Structure of Light harvesting protein:
Amino acid sequence: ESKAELESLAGKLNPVIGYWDPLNLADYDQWSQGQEAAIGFLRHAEIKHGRVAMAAFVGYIVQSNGICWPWALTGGPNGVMHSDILAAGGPADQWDALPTASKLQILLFVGGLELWSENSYVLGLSGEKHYMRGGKPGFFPSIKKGGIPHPVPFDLFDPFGLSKNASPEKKAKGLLAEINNGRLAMLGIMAFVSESKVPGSVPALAGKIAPYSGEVMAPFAASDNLPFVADMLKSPLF
Amino acid sequence: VSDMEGTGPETGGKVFDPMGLSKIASAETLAWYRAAELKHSRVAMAAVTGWAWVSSGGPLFPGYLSVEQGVTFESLGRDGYAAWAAVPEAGKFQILGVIGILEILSESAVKPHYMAGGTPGKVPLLWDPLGFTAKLSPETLARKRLAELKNGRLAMIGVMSLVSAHFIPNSVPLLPGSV
Amino acid sequence: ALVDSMEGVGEETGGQIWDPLGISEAVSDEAVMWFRASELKHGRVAMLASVGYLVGAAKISFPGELAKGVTFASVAANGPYQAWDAVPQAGKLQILSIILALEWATEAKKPHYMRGGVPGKIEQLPFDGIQGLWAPKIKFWDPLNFTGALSAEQKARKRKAELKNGRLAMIGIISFITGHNLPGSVPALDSSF
Amino acid sequence: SAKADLEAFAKECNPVVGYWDPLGLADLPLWGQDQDAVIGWLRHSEIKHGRIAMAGFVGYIAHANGFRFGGIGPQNVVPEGASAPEVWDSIPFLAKLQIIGAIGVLEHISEDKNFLAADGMKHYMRGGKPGYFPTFSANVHPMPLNLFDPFKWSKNASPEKKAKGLVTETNNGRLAMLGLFGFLSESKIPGSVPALSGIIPSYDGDYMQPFLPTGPDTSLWTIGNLWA
Ligand SMILES: CC(=O)O[C@H]1CC(C)(C)C(=C=C/C(C)=C/C=C/C(C)=C/C=C/C=C(C)/C=C/C=C(\C)C(=O)C[C@@]23O[C@]2(C)C[C@@H](O)CC3(C)C)[C@](C)(O)C1
Ligand code: KC2
Ligand code: KC2
Ligand code: KC2
Ligand code: KC2
């Protein structure tokens, strides 16, 4: 995009404010590929943080209320039940109590999705380009059209085609709602985690978020026997 | 000096010469400066790589160093200075003498001399016996020469950090006090 | 100058004659022919000696006896340096006599090298043309004619290689002997040789 | 250009990735030969490594799980329940020597000008098809079957189908390389391939030394064992 279009989108997201860049991060040229590339990267970062944050907000609400799945997570005569992962503690403790294979495969599945989004050939095959090259800032390409060898049932966005045949006006309105909901949901999820780590940080939630001891920004806990994990966790931090 | 290579985005496209040593440098003096820089950079790259491999824990040379006199590659130890102290004086003299022969061949054999209008750092034998950097175009070759200069400048600072950690103990962080 | 028209010039000294002291510049051309002949003879003798000294240092010897009482292994036992002393006298005399025959026959060729002939080109059949003397025509160099398969440029390159290897062996054999004499003078030689 | 052919071939292997040469080995002039010869060598090496890796993967499943012929043979000396690392170690020294020697003879036939010229083909580094094993039409004794397609099931296959087959060969060979060395790595650096943890047993010894341990020196010939 350009700064003018970014200002217009800000006006459409909140006409009272309009553009709000106190740091002038849009003019901050990072990656040395022009203001258009920088604004594209920032827009994608906002959209992706928002998507992950709203998803994690719903996940935190669902997991913190004792709504584990009925089926099991590990397989064998001694397998970690999802109920055991629930009983591990609060949601962050559930993640830390996951098996190492579960953690690795979750994060690597997400990584596969991320590189799939970042590749320009698949984006061009699905239409549009990389978000730093004029494409739509936040747009996951089609795992079907990319040409993976086996035919996948569904794409990641809109698997059942419910937003299909949407009005273009509804599409723009939906993207505005996506950005704003993500903007608020980032604060929501970080407020949950901040209440978990520092009690009383978010005054409204008092006694309603379980405590947590380990670092939340540490995907692998002490149970994860992998290279350097224990040495990394040896020294803690606020 | 502005048209001598080695400048990059790290300086900002300009020459890094605050003390003004380039002002008092002629063409021959500038060629000498570049030749010394290239030699020191290459030596420091080799020295850092060797010291890091030896001290880090990499698989060092199998077998004996001296069958008679009973000195072994494993027995020499992983401290760099202690290893260079315990290696035989014959071996030290041999390394130094071969390096000296190569230095004198670099000085004399390359007849268009880097001081007398030649390319600094053009040691003819000791480069690319397998011909890897033979088909590279001038642009990528200049890029790689700048890479040589940058990497080796970093290597010089690295090896001086190593010897500072060995001499002035607890001097550099990320170097255990012994060495 | 005759010094400007030889094969010994090599890139190791640039594309230029290696005469630091001007010895070739302070002499007439005849001495330059003598110099080239002696240089090549020295180089070839030196590489023969160098490979022989390495073989002696490795304690490698033929299966058999160098005389009726001594064994090849026995005379090689002490080492390459004392091996020549331990060789029997008659064998030393025979080596010296055959070398005398070689360096007399090669000298007695009338094109020569000092007086209008190629220096270093030993006549391939030294003992031919000698009246009342017979030899089996085993030509001294290339008895089985390897260099015939080469072109002129190939053998010119190999003559340059000959000069280089001969000079290197000139250094090497004296390195061996000096290392034996002064211990540690040439650190690459173990106490075995 | 050979690099242009390798460019297209990479797109066929995976159009999402395309060419992936972070080391520029195609550009490097190995042995001083030109880019065409170097790329021919690299493609031959890729296809051969892949072929041997897939054969090795199926051999791993056959041996470690237990799949042996019946009768007198090298099979009779390997201990029962022996893992895939130990079956090679347990077959006789002469069995190892003759297996490697037969493989060497096959490769000598592969790179020989004789068979390649009898088939109207050239060496892969000199304008030939990388990874093509010639028929034994120049071997001295007329040989019944050839290595590739011995029953000649692919006598009439389209050139497009053969090209797609070579594209499948390269990818499957690379993947089989990864899996076979996963099996190898799990036995010497445990917890390196997460899925194989607990499946592949540990092995003490040098894999890459072919003749260590030297193995039994038995004499399995029965009818006419005069050489013992
Ligand atoms: C906070 C603090 O205090 O931190 C401390 C800790 C820390 C950071 C560790 C420190 C340090 C030391 C450091 C960082 C030292 C750095 C050393 C460095 C940078 C060392 C380079 C070696 C390069 C070599 C040998 C390359 C050879 C390369 C070769 C032979 C080639 O190029 C060949 C070739 O490529 C060509 C040209 C053509 C291509 O076709 C490919 C081929 C292969 C044919 C300090 C200073 O103490 C500070
Ligand atoms: C992020 C999403 C995700 C994807 C896209 C994905 C895909 C595939 C595919 C296809 C490509 C296969 C073939 C496959 C196979 C197995 N998965 Mg897997 N998986 C994902 C997630 C998890 C989690 C969280 C766990 C898990 C597991 C297992 C076990 C072993 C179970 C056992 O222990 O009995 C097996 C055999 C559990 C485990 O323990 O893995 C070691 C476990 O907790 N997976 N998984
Ligand atoms: C955690 C995941 C996640 C959440 C929770 C979430 C929520 C919301 C909300 C609720 C607040 C609204 C209202 C909304 C609306 C739209 N989303 Mg959206 N979304 C998520 C993920 C993705 C991805 C991956 C894509 C995507 C898209 C679109 C488009 C398409 C417009 C078009 O077709 O032009 C519209 C209208 C796709 C696209 O192309 O966006 C440019 C696309 O790739 N979304 N999205
Ligand atoms: C290249 C040089 C060379 C040539 C061309 C050459 C030619 C001939 C010919 C033909 C023309 C005959 C017929 C002949 C005969 C004998 N040679 Mg003789 N020889 C050469 C070299 C040596 C050396 C180094 C030794 C030696 C010896 C003997 C002995 C042993 C006697 C014994 O058993 O004691 C006998 C009988 C050894 C020796 O003198 O032993 C005391 C001994 O060490 N030769 N030798
Ligand atoms: C153990 C080894 C081995 C394995 C595991 C293996 C697997 C596969 C797979 C399965 C993933 C496919 C799909 C496939 C396909 C083709 N193979 Mg291959 N192959 C092996 C060995 C050989 C040999 C020795 C030759 C050969 C060839 C061809 C040709 C070319 C046909 C033509 O163009 O005439 C095609 C299409 C011949 C050739 O010329 O290759 C350049 C040839 O000589 N293969 N091959």
